[PDB]
Amino acid sequence: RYGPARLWYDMLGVPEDDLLADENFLMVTQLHWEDDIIWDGEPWYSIFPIDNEDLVYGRWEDNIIWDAQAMPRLLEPPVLTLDPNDENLIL
């Protein structure tokens, strides 16, 4: 309740504490990639970059709210997790 989004919590007043085939959607069949062709233009750790595991792997699609009244699942308040993989954060 007191973390980021406390303003929303206070405003609410809550106080505890065949065209669907996979290929159709591959972006080779949905992108004018012919515009890209350039005509007459004018280890110890890893040599591989670390990506957001949640974006790469998680089903964030399950946080989309398709119908407000029929929310198929019950959503819960989210705690701040301060990922330390990201640089530019002191801790």
Binding site: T29, W33, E34, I37, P43, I47, T81, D83
Partner: protein, 404 residues
Amino acid sequence: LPSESMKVVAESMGIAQIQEETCQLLTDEVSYRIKEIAQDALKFMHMGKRQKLTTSDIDYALKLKNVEPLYGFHAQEFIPFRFASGGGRELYFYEEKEVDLSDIINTPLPRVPLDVCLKAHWLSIEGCQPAIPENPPRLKPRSIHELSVEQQLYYKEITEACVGSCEAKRAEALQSIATDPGLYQMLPRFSTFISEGVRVNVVQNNLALLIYLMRMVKALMDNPTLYLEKYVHELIPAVMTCIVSRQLCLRPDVDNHWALRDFAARLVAQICKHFSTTTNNIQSRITKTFTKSWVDEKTPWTTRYGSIAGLAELGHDVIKTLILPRLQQEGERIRSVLDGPVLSNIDRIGADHVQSLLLKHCAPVLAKLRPPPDNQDAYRAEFGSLGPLLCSQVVKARAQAALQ
């Protein structure tokens, strides 16, 4: 077996007027002997560990029941053909039932296959099955890359070998790309390295960097294990990043090597059209680009050439329909380069290459749909571009056909 087949056999032998109970008596006796042998030929199939029931199983099942695996002929004296089989009769239902006796002599005999050899490999290394080709295949925690450090080292070695500092290193790395089974789950990083490379490698037209990347694309394609059409979207522009595109380097000389690179690109494009094909997405999209590259006024001449090559290597019918109503424009372009006035750009080299390629395609199309009559001056109705030399190319094609 049906009884109406047993009366046909009886009356075609001299035994006429057989009763139905006489005829039913024949078809339960012989249907038992077929069932007795096929149950007995399944013993040789299960002892062969082949689960196939080959043609030789019935030859041993017959010999086991003291009947000659003699097929189509029966020797009452038994001595020239004892229980040794003759391999059956190669006969069909849809056969011709009459052949010429010199047709069987003049056909080439099939190749005797390789003899049996003993190779060893590993099914399991201390419990784990290897992925060799002889096998079927609050702070959040600090995440790990999805590649192992062998995989990043491997990827680093293969990419630093594929930029072609040494040729034997390239060739192995290309074969390693062409047959590594575990090269999936590294394929995004290879596709991104190709795509990104061509785009910052056409900023300065570095031919080798491009010829090596196109060979890397060709080595990526013929690998049978990996699934490529998730990555073809990024790849189509990267492979074609310098086909028609002009050269920021010395365009006139290495114009030979880059034209060869363009030919390789056409071949990979034709392979892509043959595969990854769904309705009206890939082949028609690159065909439309190529045609609007062709129907362009004041066309880049290094480009009047790459797009021409791309359109040309698309197969049999494509030049039969797309290379017909345009000969006059090609001739007019050639005439302008010939006029001059000065060689400001490699325009003349581009024109000669385009005309030679178009003339070879036109010969093969002509040889394909029409007889070789009036090969002297009838081509003057098509502006007289290749004429008698085109006729000579058609004659060489006819000689190759005769050799075949």
